[PDB]
Design a protein around this ligand. Structure first.
Ligand SMILES: CCCCCCCCCCCCCCCCCC(=O)OC[C@H](COP(=O)([O-])OCC(O)COP(=O)([O-])OC[C@@H](COC(=O)CCCCCCCCCCCCCCCCC)OC(=O)CCCCCCCCCCCCCCCCC)OC(=O)CCCCCCCCCCCCCCCCC
Ligand SMILES: CCCCCCCCCCCCCCCCCC(=O)OC[C@H](COP(=O)([O-])OCC(O)COP(=O)([O-])OC[C@@H](COC(=O)CCCCCCCCCCCCCCCCC)OC(=O)CCCCCCCCCCCCCCCCC)OC(=O)CCCCCCCCCCCCCCCCC
Ligand SMILES: CCCCCCCCCCC(CCCCCCCCCC)(CO[C@H]1O[C@@H](CO)[C@H](O[C@@H]2O[C@@H](CO)[C@H](O)[C@@H](O)[C@@H]2O)[C@@H](O)[C@@H]1O)CO[C@H]1O[C@@H](CO)[C@H](O[C@@H]2O[C@@H](CO)[C@H](O)[C@@H](O)[C@@H]2O)[C@@H](O)[C@H]1O
Ligand SMILES: CCCCCCCCCCC(CCCCCCCCCC)(CO[C@H]1O[C@@H](CO)[C@H](O[C@@H]2O[C@@H](CO)[C@H](O)[C@@H](O)[C@@H]2O)[C@@H](O)[C@@H]1O)CO[C@H]1O[C@@H](CO)[C@H](O[C@@H]2O[C@@H](CO)[C@H](O)[C@@H](O)[C@@H]2O)[C@@H](O)[C@H]1O
Ligand SMILES: CCCCCCCCCCCCCCCCCC(=O)OC[C@H](COP(=O)([O-])OCC[N+](C)(C)C)OC(=O)CCCCCCCCCCCCCCCCC
Ligand SMILES: CCCCCCCCCCCCCCCCCC(=O)OC[C@H](COP(=O)([O-])OCC[N+](C)(C)C)OC(=O)CCCCCCCCCCCCCCCCC
Ligand SMILES: CCCCCCCCCCCCCCCCCC(=O)OC[C@H](COP(=O)(O)OCCN)OC(=O)CCCCCCCCCCCCCCCCC
Ligand SMILES: CCCCCCCCCCCCCCCCCC(=O)OC[C@H](COP(=O)(O)OCCN)OC(=O)CCCCCCCCCCCCCCCCC
Ligand SMILES: CCCCCCCCCCCCCCCCCC(=O)OC[C@H](COP(=O)(O)OCCN)OC(=O)CCCCCCCCCCCCCCCCC
Lengths: 494, 75, 558, 81, 101, 61
């Protein structure tokens, strides 16, 4: 039983215990929440054990278990540098997501925990599978649990939201499936170790690129294909929102490393000016739009759109710096956007019952712990240094500028507007007068739970912001394998 | 109002009405001269302009280790 | 064996008028079909494209025998609906093996188990059921033009009889009239197509027609236009019987009007026999050289119908509010996928065809089984909804509206999840078996240059997903309109049950309530096995997919 | 991790579990506990049978592949003239 | 020369940095070839890191005289900056080239 | 205080010889060729498996 298969098995045992413990003890709801939390903790503990044993400079997939009982659809698991940190981010985030809803579900708690635990197994399976069809099977398997999570525990407009996220993702994924099936037909197999060895013809690469890019653009999302995010990420329960923004957005980013950079390098090189136009447009249009967004979670949801454009531009830079920056920005956005949704969807929305920004003012006066963390998360969302958000933005933007300067400059302008919308929101909530006259009751400050799910998130971004080498050390050799090009005097040694 | 009891707010009817109008605004969009031009400016022209500049200047320069007597122009 | 059972059952049925024999006759039909599986399992120890039997009027292939068994197994599963009472009484004091196998329990069962329900009083129902099966298996094994006609009428006439056998329902007699009248028109096109083959070729033998087709596929005086044109007319009649668009209008009306238990059999068994029959006829008439023959190939009627079924099935299902009409339109969209795989005549598409047909039959069976079980479960529930009160044939079709499923997740959460799994398998969400079925059809269509049809298949799939999601939303996003029956649990409304030993001597006496009334084991187990096959297919796919791979290799074996 | 007997023993165990949940009957009452060995026993029997089927399928598919290279050979050798 | 450490024994490429003569069917040898491509590129680049490092110490040590004393260290970095860059194996794996053309 | 203590005791010392605990974390994570062996057999087996399907899927009608 490989460590990687252990990762997928623990959350399934937790589901079993959650749904059977009543036959051994009316069981208290606190029991279910404790089973689910410990389950995610042991999954985090296993992912940390794997990371200690992980080797930073191996071109072999590590911790793979030999199957040799070949079938039509077999599940092979393996990990290298590009997948190791996405696996860690999934295992760190999900316990925080569980605590972020400890008190705010209050109904169908068994269903919420089983759905949350199942989502962990599926999302981890996405980052661990060593086959392109296996990748697709898990990328899509999460829609029905996502569809039912929003509908069971979402806000007032959760019906329109759940439909939007289901149908957008399916429609785009159906175009990715067509591209994937063409690959398996030509090659005979979708296993990574032998599909990357193959060489597709240019026009095949061109049509393979559109099919895959249409799906990755719905999931980034790119601007104009992002209606589903505006609805789903806001109407979802807080735990759903954290998982949706901090893990699910990353699948398309990790999928660019496994599905287009190795097999479609000519198409990627010849179409970067189209990816960059869409990437540049998304940086500006989203930034201007979130400046005028009045729902606090939708403002924070809309920020994810702007940052996802920056690491989408990085992965197509064909440079070592852009690709490392893209993973580091995708990781950084995972912590910071998780904290900002806890601040908005968890702290403000539980106190007031509303998310309109018009009703908030001067919260610093009564809530100095919320404002202290909120400001640090508003700095991190603005790409301020000593946050992992700056190291990722600077490396991602440097690659974008070097690959194509006109897009780099425009994507650079995000340094202004991210700051602009992040600080403007911060002032209309924490500063900007005395406590809002709409509040009749006074508000309490962060509970111990709220303090420690924020302190944990702001610790990860800051420590990684001062020493990003912890992550870059395990990306240097694997990131190198996805670069496409040669130097005049280093190529073809004899 | 929600599942978990919150504090008592002075829920202003005017602000509540404003936040509902925004959430429902998509149902009332119509194609007119104005709405067609704006939607054509943002979606087609400005993106196609950037795509033109990105396409035209892809590979035009390299800054790496450039010296005096050696240009930045690459094409 | 099917013929001995039909004759033997009829003789036993002929000399009785007791409607309490109906449940017993249904069980004997299950036993009889089990022997039919045994005799056809015995017959698979040979490899051949075909062995003509009985003077050359019939034939047997490995494919034919595999799908005889599948038809028998589907019929045994469906026959459970009329062989076991819908509800049972369970208690922990009568749960051991020593209890079920040595002791007896006694209580007033009649009202609890619906002993006198309409679907338990039709003596001849299992017998007409076996008649349809005989037509279906004879059609699979048919080698001759006259044998084709006789088998299709035998299966068709039985289905008309089953649609009307509930003779006191105004809905059922109306649905029986519609199927017979439009079905009789369809049978003229089959007879016309078969007759035009005979008048031109001079033979009723499918062997001889294939020989005539094969020599005429070269690269003057008797150019063989008749073969494609006749099979085109011949195929149109078979497209009606599978409810393929644009020949599909009858089925949403017939499926909704006839009782749900009848709909289960009527909507499943007929597609399997026609599609399997069509598969061989597509293979042996498929021209190789691009000549004037291939340009008039009758199989474009299949490709056009697959296109039209993909659109009609998904678009028209958007506004359906009655659950049985939605399933009818959901079926039409799925025969669109099935017909695409039949039209691409590749090794890959024929494997995809074989797998898709079996997994959809299993999946559609589950949806009907779950729908009947939810109907039998609402006995201990009441509602004040004014819409539900105005429904017709409530006893024959207890669930008629999607709105009736509102909050079923709060009435029975795990049964609601089985419905959701089945419906998510219909959309094609991985790793459910439905996804893998659509995936194989798309990969085979893509590999043969069917790009335009593959793109419409994906686009219509998103539209189809909307009404699938709409069923799921009613079950999970809303609280139910059904309340538990107060008089079933009122702290003093308790009925009595006696537990007695082998000698009919008392052992214990327990007072019971409505919460001791459960779904019968046959229906829960069948739902549970099929639901887990749908969900866990990715771990169990080797033998199932290898069977079809071998079957296609025999069919294609140069 | 695809063992025919272990998987199908578990499949039969899962069938009983889902069945009891569908009936909304308790998952583990001690007098009914014989059923899980029974369901898992029948599940194990189905998978010993699937073992033999898979063996015969592998032999037959392996035989077909040989016939396919055989057909390609004698066609290619005939083209040598 | 600096002795080869025990760590710099388990990761030495036993194969030359090239794809000529590699049978892409055989997985071990192709993977070794990709390993040799990347490690040579990284080895060449850390040369620039050490030259950059030395030039820094030279610059401070020489102060204003850095424009006249650190010349050899200046050029060596510039040559490395002109040539060394991790470009991956993927182009060379997929595209053969010959000098006798 | 813990950071100062842990860093000091984790140093390799004046000599290059690793610590007692340093050698344990290297012995456990040896994998001298294990990932290289297992991966090679998996890739070759699936390459053959893709070959067998290519034969069956392209057989002459
Ligand atoms: C040949 C004629 C000689 C045998 C016929 C008489 C046998 C005795 C039957 C009987 O019970 O008589 C009293 C019976 C009524 O007596 P009863 O007091 O009412 O008994 C209560 C019920 O009958 C309830 O009791 P029951 O339902 O058990 O009795 C009816 C009886 C009816 O069964 C039979 O009569 C057997 C007929 C063939 C022997 O038995 C059965 O239904 C069970 C066995 C079914 C055998 C079916 C054989 C089908 C042919 C298969 C061909 C392929 C085989 C390979 O009257 C009858 O004769 C019924 C049978 C109808 C007579 C025609 C049978 C021949 C039809 C054409 C030949 C088909 C071959
Ligand atoms: C993919 C395929 C994967 C295959 C493997 C997957 C796992 C297989 C699980 C199926 C196991 C079914 C089962 O045994 O349930 C027992 C089932 C347990 O239900 P329960 O909840 O404990 O209590 C029943 C209710 O109180 C009152 O009972 P009730 O009125 O609600 O139902 C009456 C009874 C039906 O009565 C029967 O047991 C039918 C017996 C027919 C003959 C079977 C033996 C043939 C040889 C006869 C000599 O219940 C059933 O057994 C329903 C079975 C439904 C199976 C449907 C076919 C597959 C779908 O029946 C019993 O009460 C004990 C019967 C013990 C012997 C069963 C008959 C022998 C079975 C041999 C199988 C091959 C060896
Ligand atoms: C955004 C959709 C992208 C979906 C990805 C499809 C997966 C790849 C199929 C693209 C396709 C048709 C595309 C037609 C128009 C595309 C959709 C039109 C607008 C959509 C609303 C390329 O089609 C061209 O491929 C060229 C070769 O590459 C050929 O030269 C052309 O003759 C051929 O037409 C199919 O060709 C492909 O089939 C495979 C056999 O498995 C063949 O090996 C190749 O032939 C391969 O290329
Ligand atoms: C998720 C479940 C996985 C899939 C479940 C089954 C998938 C694999 C089944 C393959 C299968 C069953 C066909 C029934 C299934 C039809 C559709 C099933 C629904 C599909 C869900 C067809 O096997 C046939 O396959 C054909 C190609 O496919 C071959 O051509 C045939 O030659 C081959 O027999 C196996 O058949 C075999 O059964 C065994 C009996 O033990 C037979 O052994 C013997 O039988 C008696 C002498 O006969 C003897 O008396 C008996 O002593 C002896 O033991 C075999 O002789 C053979 O008959
Ligand atoms: C982020 C929370 C981590 C746990 C919290 C507790 C530690 C928080 C940091 C406090 C200060 C720790 C650094 C003090 C530095 C003092 C010197 C020192 O101790 O160095 C010893 C060591 C470094 O020793 P070294 O650099 O001399 O050599 C050994 C390390 N190798 C050989 C690999 C180079 O520093 C540490 O180990 C600190 C580790 C801190 C956290 C490491 C990564 C945490 C995040 C993992 C997930 C990342 C992906 C997420 C998605
Ligand atoms: C789904 C898969 C169904 C497979 C059924 C099957 O193969 O059973 C074989 C069996 C074959 O039995 P059998 O005759 O081979 O029994 C074994 C013979 N010895 C002892 C020599 C090994 O077919 C049947 O038993 C028919 C009854 C089963 C069907 C009952 C309803 C289902
Ligand atoms: C690695 C490969 C894995 C392959 C899949 C393996 C299995 C994965 C899980 C599949 C479904 C398992 C369901 C587990 C829960 C079953 C146990 C149960 O009964 O839970 C009941 C629970 C609460 O209901 P209850 O407590 O009875 O009522 C109390 C009312 N006060 O009610 C619930 O928990 C229902 C929860 C909501 C439904 C689940 C989330 C949506 C699932 C959509 C199903 C279709 C897609 C399946 C996808 C499988 C994973 C990809
Ligand atoms: C917001 C902070 C931003 C930080 C940005 C990054 C730093 C740049 C700015 C600070 C510049 C100086 C940093 C400190 C330098 C010295 C660190 C130190 O304490 O080293 C001593 C200790 C032993 O020395 P040693 O490394 O073994 O020397 C021989 C090795 N050849 O070496 C050790 O390993 C001991 C480590 C002890 C723990 C770290 C001590 C940090 C000191 C500053 C703490 C600031 C935070 C204060 C927190 C609240 C305190 C009330
Ligand atoms: C308070 C508790 C605090 C958490 C304590 C655990 C978390 C520590 C996180 C870092 C772990 C560092 C220690 C370590 O390196 O353990 C590695 C361990 C050594 O085992 P090894 O002999 O190398 O076998 C490897 C075979 N592949 O590798 C292993 O083999 C361990 C295997 C663990 C299997 C866990 C199974 C599920 C447990 C739930």
């Amino acid at each position: 039983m490989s460590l990687l298969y252990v990762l997928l098995i623990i959350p399934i045992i937790g589901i079993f215990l959650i749904s059977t413990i009543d036959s051994f003890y009316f069981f208290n709801v606190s029991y279910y929440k404790k089973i689910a939390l410990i389950t995610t903790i042991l999954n985090l503990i296993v992912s940390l054990i794997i990371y200690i044993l992980f080797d930073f400079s191996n071109n072999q997939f590590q911790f793979i278990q030999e199957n040799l009982d070949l079938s039509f659809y077999d599940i092979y698991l393996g990990v290298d540098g590009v997948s190791i940190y996405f696996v860690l981010l999934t295992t760190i985030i999900m316990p925080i997501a569980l605590v972020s809803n400890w008190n705010s579900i209050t109904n169908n708690i068994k269903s919420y925990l089983i759905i949350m635990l199942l989502l962990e197994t599926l999302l981890l399976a996405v980052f661990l599978v060593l086959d392109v069809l296996l990748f697709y099977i898990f990328f899509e398997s999460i829609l029905p649990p996502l569809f039912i999570l929003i509908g069971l525990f979402g806000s007032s407009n959760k019906v329109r939201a759940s439909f939007y996220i289901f149908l957008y993702t399916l429609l785009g994924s159906l175009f990715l499936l067509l591209s994937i099936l063409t690959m398996s037909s030509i090659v005979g197999t979708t296993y990574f170790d032998v599909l990357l060895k193959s060489s597709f013809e240019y026009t095949t690469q061109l049509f393979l690129f559109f099919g895959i890019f249409i799906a990755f653009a719905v999931k980034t999302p790119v601007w104009g294909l992002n209606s589903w995010l505006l609805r789903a990420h806001v109407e979802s329960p807080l735990g759903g929102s954290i998982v949706l923004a901090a893990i699910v957005l990353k699948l398309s980013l990790y999928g660019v490393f496994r599905l287009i950079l190795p097999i479609l390098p000519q198409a990627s090189l010849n179409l970067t000016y189209i990816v960059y136009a869409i990437g540049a447009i998304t940086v500006l249009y989203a930034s201007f739009s979130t400046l005028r967004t009045v729902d606090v979670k939708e403002l924070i949801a809309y920020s994810s759109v702007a940052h996802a454009a920056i690491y989408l531009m990085g992965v197509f830079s064909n440079t070592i710096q852009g690709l490392e920056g893209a993973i580091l920005l995708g990781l950084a956005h995972g912590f910071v956007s998780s904290g900002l949704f806890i601040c908005a969807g968890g702290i403000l929305y539980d106190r007031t019952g509303t998310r309109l920004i018009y009703f908030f003012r001067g919260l610093t006066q009564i809530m100095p712990l919320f404002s202290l963390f909120f400001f640090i998360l508003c700095l991190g969302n603005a790409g301020t240094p000593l946050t992992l958000n700056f190291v990722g933005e600077f490396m991602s933007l440097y690659g974008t500028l070097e690959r194509l300067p006109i897009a780099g400059m425009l994507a650079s302008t995000s340094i202004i507007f991210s700051a602009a919308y992040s600080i403007y929101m911060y002032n209309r909530i924490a500063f900007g007068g005395s406590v809002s006259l709409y509040f009749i009751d006074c508000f309490r400050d962060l509970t111990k739970r709220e303090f420690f799910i924020l302190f944990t998130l702001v610790s990860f971004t800051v420590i990684l912001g001062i020493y990003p080498s912890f992550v870059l050390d395990g990306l240097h050799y694997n990131i190198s394998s996805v670069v496409y090009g040669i130097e005049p005097n280093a190529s073809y040694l004899t | 109002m929600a599942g978990l009891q919150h504090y008592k707010i002075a829920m202003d009817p005017a602000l509540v009405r404003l936040g509902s109008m925004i959430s429902n605004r998509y149902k009332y969009f119509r194609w007119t001269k104005r709405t067609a031009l704006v939607s054509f400016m943002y979606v087609v022209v400005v993106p196609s302009t950037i795509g033109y500049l990105a396409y035209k200047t892809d590979g035009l320069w390299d800054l790496r280790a450039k010296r005096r007597g050696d240009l930045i122009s690459e094409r | 064996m099917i013929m001995i059972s039909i004759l033997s059952l009829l003789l036993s049925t002929s000399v009785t008028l007791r409607r309490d024999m109906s449940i017993l006759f249904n069980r004997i039909s299950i036993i009889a079909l089990a022997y039919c599986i045994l005799h056809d399992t015995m017959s698979l120890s040979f490899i051949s494209k075909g062995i003509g039997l009985h003077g050359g009027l019939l034939h047997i292939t490995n494919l034919t025998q595999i799908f005889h068994i599948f038809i028998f197994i589907i019929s045994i599963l469906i026959l459970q609906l009329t062989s076991f009472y819908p509800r049972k009484v369970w208690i922990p004091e009568y749960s051991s093996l020593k209890d079920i196998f040595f002791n007896k329990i006694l209580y007033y069962r009649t009202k609890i188990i619906n002993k006198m329900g309409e679907h338990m009083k039709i003596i001849e129902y299992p017998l007409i059921l076996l008649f349809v099966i005989s037509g279906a298996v004879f059609l699979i094994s048919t080698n001759d033009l006259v044998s084709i006609f006789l088998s299709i009428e035998l299966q068709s006439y039985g289905l008309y009889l089953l649609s009307t056998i509930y003779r006191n329902s105004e809905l059922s007699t109306t649905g029986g009239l519609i199927y017979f009248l439009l079905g009789g028109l369809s049978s003229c096109f089959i007879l016309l197509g078969t007759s035009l083959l005979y008048v031109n070729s001079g033979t009723t033998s499918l062997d001889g027609l294939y020989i005539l087709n094969s020599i005429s596929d070269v690269n003057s005086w008797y150019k063989p236009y008749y073969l494609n044109f006749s099979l085109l007319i011949f195929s149109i009649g078979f497209l009606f019987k599978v409810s393929a668009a644009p020949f599909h209008f009858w089925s949403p009306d017939v499926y909704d009007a006839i009782p749900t238990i009848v709909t289960t059999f009527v909507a499943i068994i007929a597609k399997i026999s026609i599609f399997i029959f069509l598969l061989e006829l597509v293979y042996y008439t498929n021209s190789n050289a691009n000549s004037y023959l291939s340009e008039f190939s009758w199989t474009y009627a299949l490709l056009i119908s697959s296109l039209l079924s993909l659109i009609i099935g998904t678009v028209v299902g958007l506004t359906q509010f009655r659950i049985k009409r939605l399933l009818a339109y959901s079926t039409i969209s799925h025969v669109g996928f099935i017909l695409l795989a039949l039209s691409v005549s590749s090794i890959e598409s024929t494997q995809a065809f074989i797998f898709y047909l079996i997994q959809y039959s299993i999946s559609n069976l589950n949806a009907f089984f779950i729908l009947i079980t939810i109907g039998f479960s609402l006995y201990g529930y009441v509602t004040n909804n004014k819409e539900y009160k105005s429904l017709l044939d409530k006893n024959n079709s207890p669930i008629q509206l999607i709105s009736q499923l509102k909050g079923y997740f709060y009435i029975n959460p795990l049964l609601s999840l089985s419905l959701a799994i089945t419906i998510f398998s219909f959309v094609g969400v991985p790793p459910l078996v439905g996804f893998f079925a659509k995936q194989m059809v798309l990969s085979a269509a893509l590999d043969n240059g069917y790009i335009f049809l593959s793109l419409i298949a994906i686009i219509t799939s998103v539209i189809g997903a909307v009404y699938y999601l709409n069923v799921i939303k009613e079950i999970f996003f809303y609280s139910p309109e059904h309340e538990v029956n107060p008089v079933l649990n009122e702290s003093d409304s308790n009925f009595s049950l006696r537990i007695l030993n082998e000698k009919n001597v008392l052992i214990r006496s327990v007072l019971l309530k409505g919460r001791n009334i459960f779904i019968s084991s046959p229906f829960s187990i069948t739902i549970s096995i099929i639901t887990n096959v749908i969900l866990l297919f990715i771990f169990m796919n080797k033998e199932w997919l290898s069977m079809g791979t071998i079957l296609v290799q025999i069919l294609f074996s140069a | 991790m695809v063992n025919r007997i272990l998987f199908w023993t578990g499949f039969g165990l899962a069938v009983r579990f889902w069945q009891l949940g569908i009936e909304m009957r308790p998952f583990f009452n001690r007098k009914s506990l014989w059923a899980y060995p029974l369901f898992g026993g029948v599940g194990a029997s189905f998978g010993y049978w699937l073992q033999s089927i898979d063996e015969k399928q592998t032999k037959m598919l392996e035989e077909r592949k040989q016939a396919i290279l055989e057909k390609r050979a004698r066609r290619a050798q005939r083209q040598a003239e | 020369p600096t002795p080869e450490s025990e760590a710099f024994l388990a990761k030495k490429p036993q194969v030359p940095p090239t794809f000529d003569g590699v049978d892409y069917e055989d997985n071990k040898r192709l993977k070794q070839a990709q390993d040799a491509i990347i490690r040579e590129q990284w080895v060449q680049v850390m040369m620039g890191r050490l030259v950059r490092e030395e030039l820094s110490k030279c610059y401070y040590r020489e102060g204003v005289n850095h424009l006249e004393k650190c010349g050899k260290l200046r050029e060596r970095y510039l040559q490395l900056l002109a040539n060394a860059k991790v470009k991956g194996y993927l182009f060379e794996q997929q595209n053969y080239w010959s000098k006798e053309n | 205080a813990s950071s100062f203590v842990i860093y000091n005791i984790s140093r390799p010392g004046p000599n290059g010889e690793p610590s007692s605990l340093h050698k344990w974390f290297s012995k456990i994570s040896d994998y001298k060729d294990e990932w290289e062996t297992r991966n090679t057999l998996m890739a070759a087996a699936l390459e053959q498996a893709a070959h067998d399907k290519h034969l069956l899927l392209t057989a002459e009608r």
